[PDB]
Design a protein around this ligand. Structure first.
Ligand SMILES: *[C@@H]1O[C@H](CO)[C@@H](O[C@@H]2O[C@H](CO)[C@@H](O[C@@H]3O[C@H](CO)[C@@H](O)[C@H](O)[C@@H]3O)[C@H](O)[C@H]2NC(C)=O)[C@H](O)[C@H]1NC(C)=O
Lengths: 211, 235
């Protein structure tokens, strides 16, 4: 998979640049990089192809380049209508196509809001049902992009972690939920567990102790 | 004009076989290459397969482990994808995408290949809203409701909610104190865990002062299984 930043944010009129690191087997091996925009609940749209070229009827604000194994997408003068997810794709020396992880691009429409995060331990009831689930809930954050990181004590944890896609509230802020399923034993063995949401450079952290 | 429509989707059993069908229009079908692109819920795009114009050449993703086969019927302007031994992790959105293409020019003259077929271009210029595919076997089942009690951490404002887990199929409706409670209420979207069953969570923000003087009860209605539940959440 190609490497794109999880999220980039800016103000309207401001200029932005998404990077797309790759290898010598694709991006660095060919000048066939394409960029796609996917606006919410819609289907992808070609913005750039062969690195820098713009299909007919595509804004002069979308620019593309490349350097070694890393190509870029540069939006000049962000409009709100640029909001959405962006995917870079390259030809490979296996004659396959590859996609990047995707980058949620946010153009501010309302003043930034730091998330409100709460962490629940497993209920006694679930634990009598021989199961365990830590619920990590996040609300009231804008832009609508966050990074959920779980940690068992000091060490990070990736297995058994589920995270929903941010959704809009009644107050137009964003919310997201992250579950960490555990066995009753795993849950008893560790000192504590950490939920770490990263939002706009800032990171909040709550912690549940089985104790 | 240039358009693709995806169909043949729905909910299917693991280990079963499936066959999707894309339908084009507004362009010369038998001149372009075709792609399948999938997108697991909330995930990123993923390449599946590419078929040549005449359909005598196919390319598949090395991570599909050869569980997929791509085909086409140019006389019907229709593209096909077919599965075998589906898996729950095969849950995703399945897009149909044309491969850009056309003549190639040196000087002022343009050259084709034999038959006057287009050389390929390397960017999917046409997309059709994918049809969705869901892999789960669990017969209709009712949900279990566990209390997410107010952490001892909170003065200020406290948060508490219900963890409604292990139901099928969607949807589930979640109210608080019988609808009387609305402000500060956030009901999250459901997740499909490995289980093949759905889980979700509804939470409500309140003044920590209200704790012990105000009774919070989440009302869960899972119409499919005809199950209604009432749980009290307390410190
Ligand atoms: C592909 O993207 C990665 C991140 O996903 C980029 O990583 C970071 O790139 C910068 C530029 O080389 C590294 O240096 C930076 O310098 C600026 C000042 O010039 C400073 O403000 C930054 O704090 C940073 O020191 C940065 O260390 C690096 N981070 C890493 C390596 O994780 C990277 O630029 C891209 N690919 C390559 C090959 O650089």
């Amino acid at each position: 998979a190609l490497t794109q930043p999880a999220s980039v944010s800016g103000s309207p009129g401001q200029t932005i640049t998404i990077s797309c690191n790759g290898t010598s087997s694709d991006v660095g091996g060919f000048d066939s990089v394409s960029w796609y925009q996917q606006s919410p609940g819609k289907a992808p749209k070609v913005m750039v192809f062969d690195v820098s070229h713009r299909p007919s009827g595509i804004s002069n604000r979308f620019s593309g380049s490349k350097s070694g194994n890393t190509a870029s997408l540069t939006i000049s003068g962000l409009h709100i209508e640029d909001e959405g997810d962006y995917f870079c794709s390259s030809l490979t020396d296996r004659s396959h196509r590859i996609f990047g992880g995707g980058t949620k691009v946010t153009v501010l429409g309302q003043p930034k809001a730091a998330p409100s995060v709460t962490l629940f331990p497993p209920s006694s009831e679930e634990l009598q049902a021989n199961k365990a689930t830590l619920v990590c809930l996040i609300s009231d954050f804008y832009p609508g992009a966050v990074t959920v990181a779980w940690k068992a004590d000091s060490s990070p944890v990736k297995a058994g972690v589920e995270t929903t896609t941010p959704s809009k509230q009644s107050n137009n802020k964003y919310a997201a939920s992250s579950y960490l399923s555990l066995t009753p034993e795993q849950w008893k063995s560790h000192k504590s567990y950490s939920c770490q949401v990263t939002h706009e450079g800032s990171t909040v952290e709550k912690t549940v102790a089985p104790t | 004009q240039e358009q693709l429509v995806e169909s043949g989707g729905g909910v299917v059993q693991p280990g079963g076989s499936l066959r999707l069908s894309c339908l084009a229009s507004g362009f010369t079908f038998h001149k372009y290459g075709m792609h399948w692109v999938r997108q697991a819920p909330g995930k990123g795009l993923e390449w599946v397969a590419l078929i040549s114009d005449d359909g005598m050449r196919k390319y598949h993703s090395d991570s599909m482990w050869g569980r997929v086969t791509i085909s086409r019927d140019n006389s019907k302007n229709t593209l096909y994808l077919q599965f075998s031994s589906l898996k729950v992790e095969d849950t995703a959105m399945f897009f149909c995408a044309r491969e850009a293409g056309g003549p190639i020019w040196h000087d002022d003259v343009k050259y084709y290949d034999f038959n006057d077929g287009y050389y390929n271009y390397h960017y999917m210029d046409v997309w059709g809203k994918g049809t969705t595919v869901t892999v789960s076997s669990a017969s209709t089942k009712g949900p279990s409701v566990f209390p997410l009690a107010p952490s001892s951490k909170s003065g200020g404002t406290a948060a508490l909610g219900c963890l409604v887990k292990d139901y099928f199929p969607e949807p589930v409706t979640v109210s608080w104190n019988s609808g009387a409670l609305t402000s500060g209420v956030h009901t999250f979207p459901a997740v499909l865990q490995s289980s093949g069953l759905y889980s979700l969570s509804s939470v409500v923000t309140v003044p920590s002062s209200s704790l012990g003087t105000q009774t919070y009860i989440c009302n869960v209605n899972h119409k499919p299984s005809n199950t209604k539940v009432d749980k009290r959440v307390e410190p």
